[PDB]
Design a protein around this ligand. Sequence first.
Ligand SMILES: [Cl-]
Ligand SMILES: [Cl-]
Ligand code: NA
Ligand code: NA
Lengths: 424, 424
Amino acid sequence: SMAHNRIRITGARVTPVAFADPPLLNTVGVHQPYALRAVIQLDTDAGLTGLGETYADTVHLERLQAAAHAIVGRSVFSTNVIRALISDALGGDRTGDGSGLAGMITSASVVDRVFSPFEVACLDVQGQVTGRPVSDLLGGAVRDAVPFSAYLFYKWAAHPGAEPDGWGAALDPDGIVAQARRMIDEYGFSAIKLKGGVFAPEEEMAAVEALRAAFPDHPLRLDPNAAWTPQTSVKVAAGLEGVLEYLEDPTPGLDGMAEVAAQAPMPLATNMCVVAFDQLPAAVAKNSVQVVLSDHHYWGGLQRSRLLAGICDTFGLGLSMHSNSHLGISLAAMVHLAAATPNLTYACDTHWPWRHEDVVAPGALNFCDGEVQVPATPGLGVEIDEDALAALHEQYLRCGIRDRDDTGYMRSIDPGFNASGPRW
Amino acid sequence: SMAHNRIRITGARVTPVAFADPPLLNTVGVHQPYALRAVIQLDTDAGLTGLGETYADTVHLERLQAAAHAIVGRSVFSTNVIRALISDALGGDRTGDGSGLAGMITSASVVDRVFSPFEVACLDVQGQVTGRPVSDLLGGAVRDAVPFSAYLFYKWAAHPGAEPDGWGAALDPDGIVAQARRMIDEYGFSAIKLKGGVFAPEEEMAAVEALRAAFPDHPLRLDPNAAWTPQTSVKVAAGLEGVLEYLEDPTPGLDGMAEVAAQAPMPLATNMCVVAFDQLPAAVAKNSVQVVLSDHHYWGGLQRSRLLAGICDTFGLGLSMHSNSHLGISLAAMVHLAAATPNLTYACDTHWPWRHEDVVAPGALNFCDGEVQVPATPGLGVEIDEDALAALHEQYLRCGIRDRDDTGYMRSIDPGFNASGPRW
Ligand SMILES: [Cl-]
Ligand SMILES: [Cl-]
Ligand code: NA
Ligand code: NA
C-alpha cells in the first residue's frame, strides 16, 4: 500500500466552525455567543486523514491556507522539516500578534500557532499508519487517565436578548459556589479554578474562601489575567496563604511577577508572560514564575509541548495546562500529551463544561470522576462526524462572527467599556 | 502477529566486547590496547530484537543486568515508564561516579547512562515494527548525511612490546599534520579536532597553526580536557584568535570556564562541566559555555538528546557531539540523532578511524567526503553479525581488561605517573 515506504501530505481541508458559548466574564470583556475554531483535515497519499484544531480568526485562516500549500509533498513523519517550511512560507516568526486569543495573550510565536494543528494532524496520521496511539509517539503514557479542573467564571444569566442558559448568573460567592456544585456533580473534577479580574480582589477572595468551605479537599486556583498591580497582588496572596494551589498571572509582565513571587507564599503560574520559547530564559533569570501552563495550540504542537515539559523539569518549574474554548480534537490531543508527560501532575484546565456541541463522533472522551481515560486506539483516537462538522460550519457562516473579540463584544453592549488593566 | 496490539520486552542479552585501540595520549594517561563496550540485544514477544551500545566497566555491567530485569514486561513504546523503572531499580540517581569514562568525566547521571542503551534498543524495535527509520521517531531527518570531524591525538608508535600500528607516532606538529593527512585522505573529514592537554600549550598551539597551514579551509577545535588554569587558557585563546571554531574545556569547573569565556574570542564548548540536565541551569546563569557537546550515551538516549538540543536552542547555546571509542551500533544511533536535530550543525566527533573491528554487518555506515548518509531502512539500520560479536566477546574475555583505566594503564608503564590537572 505505501509505495517507497512513503506517506506524504496531498492537501489540507480547513473548516471554520462556531459553537454556542455562554456570557462568561473576564477582565477584558465577556465571551461572544459563539466561540470559533478551525478544523484541519490533513490528507495523505495513503488515504489516511489526520485531524488538528486551532483558532479561526480571519488572519489565522489565511496563514493556515498558506501553510497547507507549503507542506504538500512532505512526509507526515518529517515534522521538523514541516515547521521550517511553514516558517519560510509565513516569512519568519513575529511577536505583538494576539490573533485567536482576544488580545489577551499577544506574545506567542506566529509560526508555532500555525504549525501546531498540522503537527497534531501529522501525529494522528503517524499513529494511524503505525497502529499506535499518539501517546506512544511522545515516550508513551505514564498514567491511564488525565485529571482536569472545574473552570469557574462569573457570568451573566444570558446574552442580551437571548434565552438564559441552564447555569444561571454567577456574580458573587454564592453564585460561584452554586456553579461549582453543578459542574462537579456532572464531571467529578477534583481541582477548581476561578477566572477573576472581574470584581474587586476582596470579593474574589470571598468567592475563593466560599469554595474552600464548600469543597475542603479541592485544590483551588485563581487567575485574574494580570488585573492587579504588584502591591495589590501581594495582599491577595498573603490573604489566601494556605488556600491556593497556585496563583496565575496576578500582575502584568516578568518584572512585576518576579516582585510578587518574592513575597507570595504559593507558587505563581503563568500563561501570559511565558507563552513562547524565547521568553523562558528571562523568566528563569528573573524568577518570575514557578509554574508554566503548557498549551500545545500556541507552543507549537505536541512534541514541542514535550520539549517545554523537559525544560520546566530541568529548570525546576512546575507544569500545568492552559485552555481556551475548544472541541474534541483539541481535547484528544491534550489528553495524549498530558498522559505522556511525567511532570504534568497538576489537573489540566478545560472549557469543556461550557460547550455542548462537537465535531467528532462521541464515546472516546468521557469524563469520569474528573478525568479522561487516554484512548488506546491508533492515532488521536477521535474521528470526524461529517454531519456535525457541516452543521457547525453552517453555524459559523450564519453567526457572522469572524474574530474572537471579548472587548469589542462587551463594547457593542456597553459603548464606553475599556479593557483597562491593571484595574486594582 | 501482535496480540493486544502489544509489543513488549521479554529479556535482554548484554555482551561485553573488546576491540584494538592504539596508544592514544590524553591529559590523564594513554588508551589501553583494547577499548571495552557492552552490546545490548533487547528481545521482545514479537521476536524483534533491538540493539544498543554502552560502556563495559564492571559496575556498569551489573547495573545493566539490574535494569534488564526491571523492564521485562514493558512495551518498547513506553520509554518514559522504562526510565522510571530503571531509576527505581538502581535506587535513584547519583553523581561523583566516573565509570566507563576513565574518571575523566565524573558528574553524569547514573540512571541516564544505564537507561541509554535500552532506550536506543527500544527505538530500534519501534522503527522495525513500524517500518520507519529511527530518525522518523525524532521529528524526522532534516539532512540526508551527517558530517564528522577528524579526531587527532598525540600517540606513541606502539603499545609497549607490541607491533607498531600503521599510523606511527605523533609527538609534535609535523606528526599531527601527517596523521591528519592520512585520516582525511581516507575519510574526507571537513573539520579537525586535536586532543591536547598532553604537551605544553605553546607546542599544542604550534600543532594547531600547522594544521591551519596544511588545511586552510578546515574548521579546527582544540580540547585539552581541562589541563589549563584560567589564566593560561586566556593566553591560548588570545593566541588562537581567528583560528579555532571553538575551544573545548580549557579549564576545570563552571566558574573557571566562565572566567575564560569572558575573554575568549571564540566560543567555549564542553563535555565535562555540562554532562547532565541538572548542570544546565548553573551553566546558563554563569555564562560558562557557549556550546554543549551532546552524547546520547550519558545524557540518557536519543529522545533525551533531542530534549538537550531544544534546551540549547532555547537558551542560545550551540550544539555539537562528543564521542568515546565506539562501534557501529553507537555510530548508527549518533547518525539518526544528528540527522533529526535541526540545530546540530557542527561536525560530530567520532573515534571511528582508530578502530578496525565491529559487531554489525558492514555496508550501512560508509564515510564519504567526511559524512555518513542517514540509513533510510526501518529501525537503527544496522544488524548484529553474530560471528563478529562472538569474536569480540572472546577478545574481551582473553584481554583481561575489565574497566577503562587510562591512568592506571599509564602507571603500569610509568609507576610515578600522576593524572595531575591543571598541568599548565
Ligand atoms: Cl518529506
Ligand atoms: Cl508497558
Ligand atoms: Na491562566
Ligand atoms: Na571534549
